Amino acid sequence: AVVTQESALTTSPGETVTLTCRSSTGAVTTSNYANWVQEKPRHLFTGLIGGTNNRAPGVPARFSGSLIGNKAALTITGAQTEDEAIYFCALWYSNHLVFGGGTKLTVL
Amino acid sequence: EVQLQQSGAELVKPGASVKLSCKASGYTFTSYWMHWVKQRPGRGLEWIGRIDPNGGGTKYNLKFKSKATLTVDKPSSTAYMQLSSLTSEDSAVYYCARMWYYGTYYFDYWGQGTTLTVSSAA
Ligand SMILES: O=C1C(=O)c2cccc3cccc1c23
């Protein structure tokens, strides 16, 4: 099972931007418990969202999770300059976790 | 308040073993799962496995079952990952990351990371 993300996406500050997480085995479901993790420069990692839509405590409410079509999605509603980073998603397959390649989000 | 402190940089020879540590604090150690993740340049993140500090129960990525050994020490609130039969493919930065698992599964706090370089003695 292979998880694919957008390689890199551009947005402007204040705009809304959606990252996606695709499964090779088919459509992503709640039983994949999609996770989203953020990497900022200097290898600073922060869990954002797991189980599709549940935010970790302290995580800004502008990050939200959902299923759109056949994919899990991270939407950022009102992108901030500090949100410029790499976003990894992770799907659960019933006995193991698989990370996608990660998306580089640039904020103009 | 919550903090995960992983051990300092490591320099080990091919074929040897290494035990990396992850000291947890600012919370009840046994209440959260601990994961270990592998970061190599150009290869993104790679799940190694998770442990449950309550009972030591584990779950591994199949590709790392012959490679990684997860344990915990409850008294010192420290999770360990031993890597064995080391090669150059093991050279990476390894992270511990805790997870909440009631009704949903999400990571939150991640450790700073520990760098391993598998290097021959010239
Ligand atoms: O059910 C599990 C489980 O045993 C495990 C382990 C590690 C990571 C997980 C993410 C989502 C869901 C699940 C995870």
Side-chain angles (χ1 to χ4, degrees), chain A, chain B residues 1-61 63-122:
Chain A
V2 168
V3 180
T4 303
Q5 305 181 243
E6 289 87 6
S7 187
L9 298 169
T10 291
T11 190
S12 281
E15 287 306 300
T16 295
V17 59
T18 302
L19 284 67
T20 60
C21 187
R22 164 169 300 288
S23 169
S24 70
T25 68
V28 178
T29 66
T30 53
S31 53
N32 287 138
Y33 301 96
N35 273 242
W36 294 87
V37 173
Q38 188 201 73
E39 185 199 357
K40 306 244 279 234
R42 307 311 236 190
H43 290 153
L44 273 8
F45 280 85
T46 301
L48 302 179
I49 281 173
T52 309
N53 65 96
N54 302 104
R55 274 195 296 284
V59 170
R62 70 174 165 283
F63 299 96
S64 87
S66 73
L67 295 183
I68 305 173
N70 344 354
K71 305 189 294 193
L74 173 63
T75 295
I76 310 183
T77 306
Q80 301 292 310
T81 62
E82 53 255 45
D83 296 347
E84 169 156 319
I86 298 159
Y87 293 81
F88 292 98
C89 80
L91 305 183
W92 179 254
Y93 281 109
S94 297
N95 80 354
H96 76 269
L97 190 70
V98 183
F99 290 90
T103 292
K104 181 165 162 53
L105 180 76
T106 303
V107 188
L108 298 175
Chain B
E1 197 207 296
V2 170
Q3 301 183 313
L4 308 176
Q5 284 255 318
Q6 319 189 223
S7 60
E10 293 279 351
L11 202 247
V12 308
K13 304 164 214 156
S17 266
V18 74
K19 195 213 261 187
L20 308 177
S21 67
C22 173
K23 185 161 197 18
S25 42
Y27 77 95
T28 297
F29 190 61
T30 50
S31 292
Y32 296 80
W33 289 352
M34 200 66 94
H35 282 124
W36 288 84
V37 173
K38 174 183 173 172
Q39 191 187 37
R40 280 201 297 167
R43 308 303 177 97
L45 297 174
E46 233 191 335
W47 195 60
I48 296 173
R50 63 127 261 242
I51 195 166
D52 185 335
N54 191 44
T58 55
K59 279 237 166 216
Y60 292 93
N61 182 339
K63 182 198 152 168
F64 293 84
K65 60 186 306 206
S66 269
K67 175 63 68 185
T69 303
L70 306 177
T71 60
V72 293
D73 189 60
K74 283 160 155 218
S76 72
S77 275
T78 303
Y80 299 99
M81 172 170 69
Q82 166 160 295
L83 304 163
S84 76
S85 306
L86 291 165
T87 70
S88 83
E89 287 279 297
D90 296 321
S91 297
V93 185
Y94 294 95
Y95 301 91
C96 64
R98 77 155 209 203
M99 171 174 277
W100 169 278
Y101 55 91
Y102 280 80
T104 186
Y105 310 89
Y106 66 73
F107 297 103
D108 43 27
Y109 292 82
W110 284 59
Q112 91 271 201
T114 294
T115 296
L116 188 68
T117 299
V118 182
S119 180
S120 303

mmCIF file of all heavy atoms in Angstrom, chain B residues 14 17 28-29 35 37 40 43-44 51 65 67 73 80 82 85 91 93 97 101 106 108 112 114-115 121-122:
data_model
loop_
_atom_site.group_PDB
_atom_site.id
_atom_site.type_symbol
_atom_site.label_atom_id
_atom_site.label_comp_id
_atom_site.label_asym_id
_atom_site.label_seq_id
_atom_site.Cartn_x
_atom_site.Cartn_y
_atom_site.Cartn_z
ATOM 1 N N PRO B 14 29.123 -0.714 10.938
ATOM 2 C CA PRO B 14 28.273 -1.714 10.286
ATOM 3 C C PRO B 14 28.292 -3.066 10.997
ATOM 4 O O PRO B 14 29.357 -3.537 11.392
ATOM 5 C CB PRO B 14 28.885 -1.835 8.887
ATOM 6 C CG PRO B 14 29.558 -0.554 8.656
ATOM 7 C CD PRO B 14 30.076 -0.116 9.986
ATOM 8 N N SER B 17 25.031 -2.983 16.884
ATOM 9 C CA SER B 17 23.713 -2.559 17.324
ATOM 10 C C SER B 17 23.780 -1.196 17.994
ATOM 11 O O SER B 17 24.850 -0.723 18.383
ATOM 12 C CB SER B 17 23.129 -3.578 18.302
ATOM 13 O OG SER B 17 22.319 -4.516 17.618
ATOM 14 N N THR B 28 1.464 11.527 31.986
ATOM 15 C CA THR B 28 1.476 10.138 32.426
ATOM 16 C C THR B 28 1.931 9.245 31.271
ATOM 17 O O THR B 28 1.177 8.986 30.337
ATOM 18 C CB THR B 28 0.086 9.725 32.954
ATOM 19 O OG1 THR B 28 -0.234 10.510 34.109
ATOM 20 C CG2 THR B 28 0.092 8.294 33.483
ATOM 21 N N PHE B 29 3.186 8.809 31.357
ATOM 22 C CA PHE B 29 3.840 7.938 30.373
ATOM 23 C C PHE B 29 2.993 6.772 29.863
ATOM 24 O O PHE B 29 2.950 6.519 28.661
ATOM 25 C CB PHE B 29 5.108 7.367 31.005
ATOM 26 C CG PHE B 29 6.010 6.653 30.043
ATOM 27 C CD1 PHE B 29 6.563 7.322 28.959
ATOM 28 C CD2 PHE B 29 6.331 5.318 30.236
ATOM 29 C CE1 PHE B 29 7.408 6.665 28.072
ATOM 30 C CE2 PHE B 29 7.176 4.661 29.360
ATOM 31 C CZ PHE B 29 7.713 5.334 28.275
ATOM 32 N N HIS B 35 5.436 6.109 19.253
ATOM 33 C CA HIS B 35 5.855 5.651 17.948
ATOM 34 C C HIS B 35 7.322 5.971 17.698
ATOM 35 O O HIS B 35 7.910 6.814 18.363
ATOM 36 C CB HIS B 35 5.040 6.342 16.892
ATOM 37 C CG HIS B 35 3.667 5.789 16.711
ATOM 38 N ND1 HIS B 35 2.532 6.555 16.809
ATOM 39 C CD2 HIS B 35 3.249 4.568 16.322
ATOM 40 C CE1 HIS B 35 1.477 5.800 16.532
ATOM 41 N NE2 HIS B 35 1.887 4.591 16.243
ATOM 42 N N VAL B 37 9.763 6.782 14.207
ATOM 43 C CA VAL B 37 9.677 7.132 12.802
ATOM 44 C C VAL B 37 11.089 7.357 12.291
ATOM 45 O O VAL B 37 11.955 7.784 13.035
ATOM 46 C CB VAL B 37 8.815 8.398 12.626
ATOM 47 C CG1 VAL B 37 8.841 8.913 11.174
ATOM 48 C CG2 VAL B 37 7.390 8.118 13.073
ATOM 49 N N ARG B 40 14.923 9.774 6.290
ATOM 50 C CA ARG B 40 16.099 9.829 5.444
ATOM 51 C C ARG B 40 15.905 10.903 4.385
ATOM 52 O O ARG B 40 14.784 11.145 3.954
ATOM 53 C CB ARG B 40 16.347 8.480 4.784
ATOM 54 C CG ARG B 40 17.034 7.499 5.684
ATOM 55 C CD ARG B 40 17.727 6.389 4.940
ATOM 56 N NE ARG B 40 16.779 5.581 4.179
ATOM 57 C CZ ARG B 40 17.121 4.708 3.241
ATOM 58 N NH1 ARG B 40 18.400 4.517 2.932
ATOM 59 N NH2 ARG B 40 16.182 4.019 2.605
ATOM 60 N N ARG B 43 13.555 10.443 1.207
ATOM 61 C CA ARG B 43 12.667 9.304 1.457
ATOM 62 C C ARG B 43 11.557 9.637 2.458
ATOM 63 O O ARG B 43 10.918 8.737 3.000
ATOM 64 C CB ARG B 43 13.471 8.104 1.976
ATOM 65 C CG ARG B 43 14.673 7.711 1.128
ATOM 66 C CD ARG B 43 14.347 7.383 -0.314
ATOM 67 N NE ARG B 43 15.561 7.085 -1.077
ATOM 68 C CZ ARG B 43 16.035 5.864 -1.338
ATOM 69 N NH1 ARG B 43 15.411 4.766 -0.911
ATOM 70 N NH2 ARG B 43 17.153 5.740 -2.044
ATOM 71 N N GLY B 44 11.334 10.924 2.708
ATOM 72 C CA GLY B 44 10.227 11.366 3.540
ATOM 73 C C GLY B 44 10.286 10.825 4.954
ATOM 74 O O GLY B 44 11.338 10.862 5.592
ATOM 75 N N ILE B 51 4.798 1.258 20.386
ATOM 76 C CA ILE B 51 4.680 0.520 21.623
ATOM 77 C C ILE B 51 3.579 1.140 22.501
ATOM 78 O O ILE B 51 3.230 2.308 22.349
ATOM 79 C CB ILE B 51 6.044 0.493 22.348
ATOM 80 C CG1 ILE B 51 6.042 -0.569 23.452
ATOM 81 C CG2 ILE B 51 6.408 1.883 22.890
ATOM 82 C CD1 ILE B 51 7.415 -0.893 23.977
ATOM 83 N N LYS B 65 10.614 -5.428 11.074
ATOM 84 C CA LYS B 65 10.432 -6.404 12.154
ATOM 85 C C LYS B 65 11.735 -7.127 12.499
ATOM 86 O O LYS B 65 11.983 -7.418 13.663
ATOM 87 C CB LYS B 65 9.281 -7.389 11.889
ATOM 88 C CG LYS B 65 9.392 -8.256 10.649
ATOM 89 C CD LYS B 65 8.119 -9.085 10.425
ATOM 90 C CE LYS B 65 7.736 -9.920 11.643
ATOM 91 N NZ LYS B 65 6.936 -11.131 11.285
ATOM 92 N N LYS B 67 14.569 -5.649 12.231
ATOM 93 C CA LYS B 67 15.500 -4.547 12.446
ATOM 94 C C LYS B 67 15.310 -3.831 13.796
ATOM 95 O O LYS B 67 16.287 -3.501 14.459
ATOM 96 C CB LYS B 67 15.359 -3.546 11.291
ATOM 97 C CG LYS B 67 16.187 -2.266 11.420
ATOM 98 C CD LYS B 67 17.683 -2.539 11.443
ATOM 99 C CE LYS B 67 18.182 -3.048 10.098
ATOM 100 N NZ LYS B 67 19.616 -3.420 10.147
ATOM 101 N N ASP B 73 10.724 1.658 29.792
ATOM 102 C CA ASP B 73 11.026 1.579 31.207
ATOM 103 C C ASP B 73 10.059 2.539 31.879
ATOM 104 O O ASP B 73 10.197 3.751 31.750
ATOM 105 C CB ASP B 73 12.479 1.974 31.473
ATOM 106 C CG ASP B 73 12.904 1.703 32.904
ATOM 107 O OD1 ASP B 73 12.855 0.529 33.320
ATOM 108 O OD2 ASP B 73 13.301 2.593 33.685
ATOM 109 N N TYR B 80 12.578 2.990 24.407
ATOM 110 C CA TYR B 80 13.816 2.663 23.699
ATOM 111 C C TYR B 80 13.517 2.014 22.350
ATOM 112 O O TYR B 80 12.503 1.335 22.188
ATOM 113 C CB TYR B 80 14.663 1.714 24.543
ATOM 114 C CG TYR B 80 15.063 2.299 25.872
ATOM 115 C CD1 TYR B 80 14.366 1.986 27.036
ATOM 116 C CD2 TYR B 80 16.133 3.179 25.966
ATOM 117 C CE1 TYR B 80 14.734 2.528 28.257
ATOM 118 C CE2 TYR B 80 16.508 3.724 27.182
ATOM 119 C CZ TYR B 80 15.808 3.400 28.320
ATOM 120 O OH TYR B 80 16.193 3.955 29.517
ATOM 121 N N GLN B 82 15.960 -0.294 19.837
ATOM 122 C CA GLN B 82 17.223 -0.884 19.440
ATOM 123 C C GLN B 82 17.143 -1.154 17.942
ATOM 124 O O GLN B 82 16.132 -1.622 17.447
ATOM 125 C CB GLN B 82 17.497 -2.164 20.240
ATOM 126 C CG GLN B 82 18.623 -3.038 19.683
ATOM 127 C CD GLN B 82 19.189 -4.010 20.710
ATOM 128 O OE1 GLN B 82 19.782 -3.595 21.707
ATOM 129 N NE2 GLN B 82 19.013 -5.303 20.462
ATOM 130 N N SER B 85 22.088 -5.214 13.368
ATOM 131 C CA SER B 85 22.615 -5.642 12.080
ATOM 132 C C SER B 85 22.732 -4.442 11.162
ATOM 133 O O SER B 85 22.308 -4.476 10.014
ATOM 134 C CB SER B 85 21.713 -6.713 11.463
ATOM 135 O OG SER B 85 21.520 -7.781 12.367
ATOM 136 N N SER B 91 21.280 4.550 8.382
ATOM 137 C CA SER B 91 21.687 5.931 8.633
ATOM 138 C C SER B 91 20.526 6.872 8.354
ATOM 139 O O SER B 91 20.055 6.967 7.221
ATOM 140 C CB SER B 91 22.866 6.332 7.753
ATOM 141 O OG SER B 91 23.993 5.544 8.044
ATOM 142 N N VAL B 93 17.733 10.095 10.614
ATOM 143 C CA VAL B 93 17.301 10.720 11.854
ATOM 144 C C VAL B 93 16.059 9.981 12.311
ATOM 145 O O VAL B 93 15.111 9.849 11.541
ATOM 146 C CB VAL B 93 16.954 12.201 11.660
ATOM 147 C CG1 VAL B 93 16.618 12.849 13.010
ATOM 148 C CG2 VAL B 93 18.099 12.934 10.969
ATOM 149 N N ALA B 97 7.410 9.765 18.729
ATOM 150 C CA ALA B 97 6.236 10.635 18.651
ATOM 151 C C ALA B 97 5.061 9.981 19.361
ATOM 152 O O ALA B 97 4.673 8.863 19.021
ATOM 153 C CB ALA B 97 5.878 10.898 17.206
ATOM 154 N N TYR B 101 -5.135 7.567 21.610
ATOM 155 C CA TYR B 101 -5.841 6.493 20.903
ATOM 156 C C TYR B 101 -7.306 6.217 21.324
ATOM 157 O O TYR B 101 -7.920 5.293 20.795
ATOM 158 C CB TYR B 101 -4.998 5.211 20.939
ATOM 159 C CG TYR B 101 -4.606 4.787 22.326
ATOM 160 C CD1 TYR B 101 -5.405 3.915 23.052
ATOM 161 C CD2 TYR B 101 -3.443 5.264 22.919
ATOM 162 C CE1 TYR B 101 -5.058 3.522 24.329
ATOM 163 C CE2 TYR B 101 -3.090 4.881 24.196
ATOM 164 C CZ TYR B 101 -3.904 4.011 24.894
ATOM 165 O OH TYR B 101 -3.560 3.620 26.158
ATOM 166 N N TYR B 106 -4.316 10.146 16.823
ATOM 167 C CA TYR B 106 -3.535 11.275 16.334
ATOM 168 C C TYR B 106 -2.192 11.365 17.054
ATOM 169 O O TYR B 106 -2.097 11.034 18.229
ATOM 170 C CB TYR B 106 -4.330 12.589 16.470
ATOM 171 C CG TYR B 106 -4.626 13.033 17.891
ATOM 172 C CD1 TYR B 106 -3.627 13.546 18.707
ATOM 173 C CD2 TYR B 106 -5.919 12.960 18.409
ATOM 174 C CE1 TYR B 106 -3.892 13.947 20.004
ATOM 175 C CE2 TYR B 106 -6.198 13.367 19.703
ATOM 176 C CZ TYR B 106 -5.180 13.861 20.498
ATOM 177 O OH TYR B 106 -5.435 14.265 21.789
ATOM 178 N N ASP B 108 0.704 13.925 18.533
ATOM 179 C CA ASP B 108 0.849 15.332 18.902
ATOM 180 C C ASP B 108 2.329 15.709 19.078
ATOM 181 O O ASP B 108 2.936 16.261 18.163
ATOM 182 C CB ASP B 108 -0.014 15.729 20.116
ATOM 183 C CG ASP B 108 0.005 14.710 21.243
ATOM 184 O OD1 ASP B 108 0.993 13.971 21.392
ATOM 185 O OD2 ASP B 108 -0.935 14.599 22.057
ATOM 186 N N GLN B 112 12.875 15.828 19.329
ATOM 187 C CA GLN B 112 13.755 16.616 18.467
ATOM 188 C C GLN B 112 14.441 15.775 17.388
ATOM 189 O O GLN B 112 14.758 16.288 16.315
ATOM 190 C CB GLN B 112 14.790 17.390 19.301
ATOM 191 C CG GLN B 112 16.143 16.681 19.559
ATOM 192 C CD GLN B 112 16.163 15.811 20.807
ATOM 193 O OE1 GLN B 112 17.231 15.509 21.331
ATOM 194 N NE2 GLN B 112 14.992 15.411 21.278
ATOM 195 N N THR B 114 17.146 12.029 16.715
ATOM 196 C CA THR B 114 18.501 11.546 16.946
ATOM 197 C C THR B 114 19.073 11.091 15.622
ATOM 198 O O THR B 114 18.430 10.347 14.898
ATOM 199 C CB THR B 114 18.500 10.356 17.920
ATOM 200 O OG1 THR B 114 18.062 10.783 19.215
ATOM 201 C CG2 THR B 114 19.922 9.834 18.160
ATOM 202 N N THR B 115 20.294 11.512 15.321
ATOM 203 C CA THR B 115 20.940 11.133 14.074
ATOM 204 C C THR B 115 21.826 9.906 14.287
ATOM 205 O O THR B 115 22.601 9.840 15.246
ATOM 206 C CB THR B 115 21.736 12.321 13.519
ATOM 207 O OG1 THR B 115 20.832 13.388 13.202
ATOM 208 C CG2 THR B 115 22.385 11.995 12.184
ATOM 209 N N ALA B 121 35.049 1.832 10.473
ATOM 210 C CA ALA B 121 36.305 2.322 11.043
ATOM 211 C C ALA B 121 37.414 2.071 10.022
ATOM 212 O O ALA B 121 37.804 0.922 9.787
ATOM 213 C CB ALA B 121 36.611 1.624 12.349
ATOM 214 N N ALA B 122 37.899 3.159 9.416
ATOM 215 C CA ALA B 122 38.870 3.126 8.308
ATOM 216 C C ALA B 122 40.068 2.192 8.541
ATOM 217 O O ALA B 122 40.496 1.975 9.679
ATOM 218 C CB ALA B 122 39.364 4.542 8.013
#
